[PDB]
Amino acid sequence: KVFGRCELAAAMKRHGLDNYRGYSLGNWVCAAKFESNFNTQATNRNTDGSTDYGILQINSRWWCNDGRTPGSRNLCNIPCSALLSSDITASVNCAKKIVSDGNGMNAWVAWRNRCKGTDVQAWIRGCRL
Ligand SMILES: [Cl-]
Ligand SMILES: [Cl-]
Ligand code: NA
């Protein structure tokens, strides 16, 4: 599923991401835009053989099991395929664990490079939330 901007914002808010660990909703929408272009089915292979999955490009080296990242951890205790669902629940619950692990949203390179320090509230402007 390819989310609209406000649709995703509303879904993320309902799943408790607005101001989760201090990150306003606009930070999560901006990250999703640049990580996956709002497409729950996005995958991308990394150099080390791991793969990023779903709307927030969660990495199989640490967070989910895809059966082909040797020596990887499965810290969200889910198959990576669950992160590709049109229901964002699994991706959100796993992101909550990632953003709480100490490095905040700096775990998402696109957030660090394209969202951090910007006017992220623009990403939720005009949405009915
Ligand atoms: Cl915001
Ligand atoms: Cl980047
Ligand atoms: Na959803």
Curated annotation (Swiss-Prot):
Known tissue expression: In the egg white and polymorphonuclear leukocytes.
One Gene Ontology CC term in the entry: extracellular space
Localization, UniProt: Secreted
Species per Swiss-Prot/TrEMBL record: Gallus gallus (Chicken)
UniProt KW keywords: Allergen, Antimicrobial, Bacteriolytic enzyme, Disulfide bond, Glycosidase, Hydrolase, Secreted, Signal
Protein task: Lysozymes have primarily a bacteriolytic function; those in tissues and body fluids are associated with the monocyte-macrophage system and enhance the activity of immunoagents. Has bacteriolytic activity against M.luteus.
A Pfam family the protein falls into: Lys
Binding, substrate: 101
Statement: the UniProt record of this protein carries the keyword Flavoprotein: no
Principal subcellular localisation of the protein: secreted
GO biological process, one term: cell wall macromolecule catabolic process
UniProt keyword Hydrolase present: yes
GO MF entry, a single one: identical protein binding
Protein name: Lysozyme C
